[PDB]
Design a protein around this ligand. Sequence first.
Ligand SMILES: *[C@@H]1O[C@H](CO)[C@@H](O[C@@H]2O[C@H](CO)[C@@H](O)[C@H](O)[C@H]2NC(C)=O)[C@H](O)[C@H]1NC(C)=O
Ligand SMILES: *[C@@H]1O[C@H](CO)[C@@H](O[C@@H]2O[C@H](CO)[C@@H](O)[C@H](O)[C@H]2NC(C)=O)[C@H](O)[C@H]1NC(C)=O
Ligand SMILES: *[C@@H]1O[C@H](CO)[C@@H](O)[C@H](O)[C@H]1NC(C)=O
Ligand SMILES: *[C@@H]1O[C@H](CO)[C@@H](O)[C@H](O)[C@H]1NC(C)=O
Ligand SMILES: *[C@@H]1O[C@H](CO)[C@@H](O)[C@H](O)[C@H]1NC(C)=O
Ligand SMILES: *[C@@H]1O[C@H](CO)[C@@H](O)[C@H](O)[C@H]1NC(C)=O
Lengths: 176, 50, 105, 6
Amino acid sequence: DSTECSNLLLQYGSFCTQLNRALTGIAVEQDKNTQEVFAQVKQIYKTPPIKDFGGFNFSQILPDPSKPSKRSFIEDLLFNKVTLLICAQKFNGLTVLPPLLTDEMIAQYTSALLAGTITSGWTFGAGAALQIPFAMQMAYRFNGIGVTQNVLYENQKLIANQFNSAIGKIQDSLSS
Amino acid sequence: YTMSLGAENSVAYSNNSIAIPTNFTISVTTEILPVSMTKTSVDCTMYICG
Amino acid sequence: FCGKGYHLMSFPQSAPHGVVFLHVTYVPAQEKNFTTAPAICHDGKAHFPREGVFVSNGTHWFVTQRNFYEPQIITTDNTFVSGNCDVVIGIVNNTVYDPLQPELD
Amino acid sequence: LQPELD
Ligand SMILES: *[C@@H]1O[C@H](CO)[C@@H](O[C@@H]2O[C@H](CO)[C@@H](O)[C@H](O)[C@H]2NC(C)=O)[C@H](O)[C@H]1NC(C)=O
Ligand SMILES: *[C@@H]1O[C@H](CO)[C@@H](O[C@@H]2O[C@H](CO)[C@@H](O)[C@H](O)[C@H]2NC(C)=O)[C@H](O)[C@H]1NC(C)=O
Ligand SMILES: *[C@@H]1O[C@H](CO)[C@@H](O)[C@H](O)[C@H]1NC(C)=O
Ligand SMILES: *[C@@H]1O[C@H](CO)[C@@H](O)[C@H](O)[C@H]1NC(C)=O
Ligand SMILES: *[C@@H]1O[C@H](CO)[C@@H](O)[C@H](O)[C@H]1NC(C)=O
Ligand SMILES: *[C@@H]1O[C@H](CO)[C@@H](O)[C@H](O)[C@H]1NC(C)=O
């Protein structure tokens, strides 16, 4: 608050203007990073009420639909597994400025993408989203990695088991 | 106002139902990139000193 | 990466410090709502599409390209066998045409 | 195929 200092300081540029350019940089990054999750779905796709996803019990990666926090269970873990004085920082003269988007908004988009992918063929990335049974959608992926698409269906239960188990092991592992 | 995230809807998923496109349109679209700044230089004995 | 939607090609155009890319990309537009069978069951042989997806308007099943509706009759020439129908989750019974038979004269 | 043609 020193007046006399504030007079002596009348000799230089207001260089924290340039800091603010980084800050909006960060904000547009925070958009850009997930514009595919955001902008490339201007359609906010909801998950369907149906859950007949070929036996692939991926429930825990969806938003927890009952909860106020619309995060996934796993997202809720992740949010807690990060170890998340600011009021002193403020009065000392240093100020955080809040995110442009809340984690609820962000998680709503993440939900939108989980939904789009599972509900629909990847043409939703081309905007012309199309429904498709999830099994078919995976069979094309196998053909994409040069495995003949009969092999998925011939073993679909085994894949679904393996998948569910692996997701299991992940969220177990995310306990530490 | 509290901004809207987008347009809410849902894809009509079902364990048997496909959609396939019919008529199509060629998008033409522009993407833009910078390739150089302007080249500059500073003799200290002009800038720092006259 | 090269524009949005399925990329065909791009052209450069110069700019005072940069480049403009015109991207030519395919976008599918109008569409339909149908049932897809995961595979077709024939005389015990499962059949699978050599390239596409099985679709139906309800009267009959047709195999089509993935990205533009253009049905053709499901046949040996365009489907391949892979073991018995019983293994598939939800296979559907149909004929498979085969072109050979008019040649048997 | 020849077995088929017979
Ligand atoms: C795809 O869409 C285009 C655009 O509507 C169709 O072209 C139209 O065809 C009608 C009848 O020939 C004309 O009256 C319109 O003027 C055309 N519009 C334009 C801008 O070309 C085209 O026929 C459609 N094709 C199919 C088979 O879907
Ligand atoms: C269409 O497919 C179904 C299921 O594969 C067939 O149902 C079987 O029919 C045989 C012969 O009657 C029975 O012995 C089996 O017990 C049936 N299985 C089931 C799941 O019900 C049905 O026959 C097929 N139709 C034709 C014309 O082939
Ligand atoms: C998915 O798995 C969880 C954890 O076992 C279980 O509670 C839930 O009932 C399962 N749901 C279905 C339909 O698979
Ligand atoms: C496809 O089905 C959904 C669900 O009924 C419906 O809302 C949509 O209008 C349908 N579109 C067409 C053109 O068939
Ligand atoms: C379905 O396609 C077949 C083959 O052309 C045609 O004969 C039939 O009339 C069509 N029916 C409907 C309801 O589209
Ligand atoms: C799709 O779901 C319905 C309702 O559960 C069921 O009757 C039908 O058999 C299912 N078909 C397949 C093979 O997924």
